[PDB]
């Protein structure tokens, strides 16, 4: 419109209306010129690429991308607490994106005639990098100004070399809207139907579903021998009931497992060797091994043991200001998934036992351990929990088949997720950057809780009494911090 006319206002708030929530977040960003306006091919060969597992080939692009994919973007710690204490489930409905108050600079003075190239890929023709849990997300704290991350992608390879089936994508070859300092951009995206995230912890366990007061009418084999001695064989059958629960016939069994190695938090308990990569469970694809992380959703540890965690089984966030390499465990924040302990196997334990032979007069009954177990009819399981720091959605890879598309790092899997938003400054050149404002608005449908539980629930609350810094607030230096990772599961349901 004009140099002196504003193209938008500052909208941040959250509206709680009936069965829905509407969250709105506005941030201030800065976009540098990347790659000196060039496409630059990248490979492991540039950085030296010593190993086969790490061998990659791809391209780096001058463009940036907006990433709002994490929850702390859209929810204040109070709104998160409001949401998790009162509700059994939630899910995104609508999306409203806006880009306004653009300012392009030259290197520093205002260059009023420049444009900004922005577009969204709504047909999903470009590689989708927003589901890999990268950085560049809008700051948790509204005051903070952030830098837009550089866009880039990978394609097929053999080692460092490319192949014929590889692809190349020109982000200039797309249609895009070119905005000046007076133009603004907006669009609205409607989420596809997805299940409500289950923000609750079961009040029953999968093996306790029985009535403790009654006997079953099914019988089991109690005794195979009358006593000690020769030729003592017998068949004795008893009733399954309150006195022996383990043997009762059950309608449902816990979910699948792929076992993890358990590392103790007390370092002296751990073996004196390097097992971080050698001992880690992994999956190989086309000859390259890859760590299984976080893996299938499984309880982090057995009850009563809080010091053990799966080797790559749970998400691990950083504390504010944590270094990149070889930080101590008190720097990282490891999440315990133990709320799914009711329906899911422990990640570090065998699923169960199976008979390995045919018993006979000579042969004893012999059983092995089941380290990994796939889906069986009659399994019921819980998905991994979502966190205030965690991802929201992921893109379902386009494929002939999949099972339970929910992404393994948590969140809402989508065939057509919120689209990518690409931005760069229009181009020897003038050294030039830009800044502006962004507002994202998501509608959230809520599932109310009608539990008839008599006693009070467990809630998320701030425990401390007197402390130097209130949690989830700035310090003396003005640095915002998130003290702990907060789960979504407090309220309970019957299994």
């Amino acid at each position: 419109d004009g140099v002196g006319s504003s193209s938008g206002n500052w909208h941040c708030d959250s509206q709680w209306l009936g069965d829905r929530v509407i969250t709105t977040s506005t941030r201030t960003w800065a976009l540098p010129t990347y790659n000196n306006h060039l496409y630059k091919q990248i490979s492991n060969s540039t950085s030296g690429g010593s190993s086969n597992d790490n061998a990659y080939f791809g391209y780096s692009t001058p463009w940036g991308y907006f990433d709002f994919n994490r929850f702390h973007c859209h929810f204040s710690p109070r709104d998160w607490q409001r949401l998790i204490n009162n509700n059994w489930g939630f899910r995104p409905k609508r999306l409203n994106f806006k880009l306004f108050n653009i300012q392009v600079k030259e290197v520093i003075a205002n260059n009023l005639t420049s444009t900004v190239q922005v577009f969204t890929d709504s047909d999903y023709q470009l590689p989708y990098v927003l589901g890999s849990a990268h950085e560049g997300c809008l700051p948790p704290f509204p005051a903070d100004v952030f830098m837009i991350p550089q866009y880039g992608y990978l394609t097929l390879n053999d080692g460092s070399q490319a192949v014929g089936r590889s692809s190349f994508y020109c982000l200039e070859y797309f249609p895009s809207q070119m905005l000046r300092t007076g133009n603004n951009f907006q669009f609205s995206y409607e989420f596809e139907n997805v299940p409500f995230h289950s923000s609750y912890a079961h009040s029953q366990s999968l093996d306790r579903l029985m009535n403790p007061l009654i006997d079953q009418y099914l019988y089991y084999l109690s005794k195979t021998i009358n006593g000690s001695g020769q030729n003592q064989q017998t068949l004795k059958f008893s009733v399954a009931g309150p006195s022996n629960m383990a043997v009762q016939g059950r309608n449902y069994i816990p979910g699948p497992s792929y076992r993890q190695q358990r590392v103790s938090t007390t370092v002296t308990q751990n073996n004196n060797s390097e097992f971080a990569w050698p001992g880690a469970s992994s999956w190989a694809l086309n000859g390259r091994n890859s760590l299984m992380n976080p893996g299938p959703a499984m309880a982090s540890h057995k009850e009563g043991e809080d010091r053990f965690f799966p080797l790559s089984g749970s998400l691990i966030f950083g504390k504010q200001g944590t270094g990149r390499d070889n930080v101590d465990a008190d720097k990282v924040m490891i999440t315990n998934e133990e709320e799914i302990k009711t329906t899911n196997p422990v990640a570090t334990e065998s699923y169960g036992q199976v008979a390995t032979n045919h018993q006979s007069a000579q042969a004893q009954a012999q059983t092995g351990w089941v380290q990994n177990q796939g889906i069986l009819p009659g399994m019921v399981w819980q998905d991994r929990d979502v966190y205030l720091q965690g991802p929201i959605w992921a893109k379902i890879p386009h494929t002939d088949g999949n099972f339970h598309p929910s992404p393994l790092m948590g969140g809402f899997g989508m065939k057509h997720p919120p689209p990518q938003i690409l931005i760069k400054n229009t181009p020897s050149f003038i050294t030039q950057y830009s800044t502006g404002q962004v507002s994202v608005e998501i509608e959230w449908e809520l599932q109310k809780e009608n539990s008839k539980r008599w006693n009070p629930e467990i809630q998320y609350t701030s425990n401390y009494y007197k402390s130097n810094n209130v949690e989830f607030a700035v310090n003396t230096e003005g640095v915002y911090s998130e003290p702990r990772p907060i789960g979504t599961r407090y309220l309970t349901r019957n299994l």
Epitope: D306, N463, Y464, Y465, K466
Partner: antibody, heavy 126, light 104 residues
Framework: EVQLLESGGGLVHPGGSLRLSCAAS????????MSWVRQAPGKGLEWVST????????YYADSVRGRFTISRDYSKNTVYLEMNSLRADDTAIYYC?????????????????????WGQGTRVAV | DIQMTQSPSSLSASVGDRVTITCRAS??????VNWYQQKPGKAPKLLIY???SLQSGVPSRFSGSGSGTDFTLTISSLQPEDFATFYC?????????FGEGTKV
């Protein structure tokens, strides 16, 4: 489980200062009172200090009072027992004990009952 | 300040046969007394609280009794695991007080 790691260690010169820490894990930190019990070489074990779960009430032993100071950090789930102007008889191995009684803020009650879960302890030589 | 005095200072006994230790408090402290045991090189362990109540991990062969001034710690079926210095504690009022102890 319930786990208490105290290390202040130390060998200090009389009149010097020392700060014991006890890192508590596995229980609700705020709802239990934490205390320090002391045992000299070849002697009986002697109560030193205790602190309320909310840290509103700190109780010191008569010999200790005015010198040692007990406090708890809610961020690190750690209880501190800083001691200054130490004396010869302060030589002993100090223990960190969780209280049996669970409390909350909505009732005025004594915060000490019995020491349910102890800790291996550290040595203070002076 | 309240004083706990534990009457046997040291003791030795045959295994399996009953042993009893008592301590007498300086005032009526009702049911506040507690009992502990400490083996050499090991941290103490809580046995009895609120005069007679036994801790979840303590064997049923331990028991305790009394109110006001007098309290007794009775051990039936003494065992080799049971030989350690024993203490009684007041929970009644601060500053808290441990008895002198009894080496068994």
């Amino acid at each position: 489980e319930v786990q208490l790691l105290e290390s202040g260690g130390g060998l200090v010169h009389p009149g010097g200062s020392l700060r014991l820490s006890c890192a508590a894990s596995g229980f609700p930190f705020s709802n239990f009172a934490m205390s320090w019990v002391r045992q000299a070489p070849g002697k009986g074990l002697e109560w030193v200090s205790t602190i309320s779960g909310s840290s509103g009430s700190t109780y010191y032993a008569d010999s200790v009072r005015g010198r040692f100071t007990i406090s708890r950090d809610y961020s690190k789930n750690t209880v501190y027992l800083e001691m200054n102007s130490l004396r010869a008889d302060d030589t002993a191995i100090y223990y960190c004990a969780k209280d049996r009684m669970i409390t909350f803020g909505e009732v005025i009650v004594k915060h000490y009952d019995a020491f349910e879960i102890w800790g291996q302890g550290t040595r203070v030589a002076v | 300040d309240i004083q706990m005095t534990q009457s046997p200072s040291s003791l030795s006994a045959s295994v399996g046969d009953r042993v009893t230790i008592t301590c007498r408090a300086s005032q009526t402290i009702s049911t506040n007394v507690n009992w502990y045991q400490q083996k050499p090189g090991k941290a103490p362990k809580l046995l009895i609280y609120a005069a007679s109540s036994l801790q979840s991990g303590v064997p049923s062969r331990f028991s305790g009794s009394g109110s006001g001034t007098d309290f007794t710690l009775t051990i039936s079926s003494l065992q080799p695991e049971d030989f350690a210095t024993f203490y009684c504690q007041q929970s009644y009022s601060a500053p808290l007080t441990f008895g002198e102890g009894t080496k068994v």
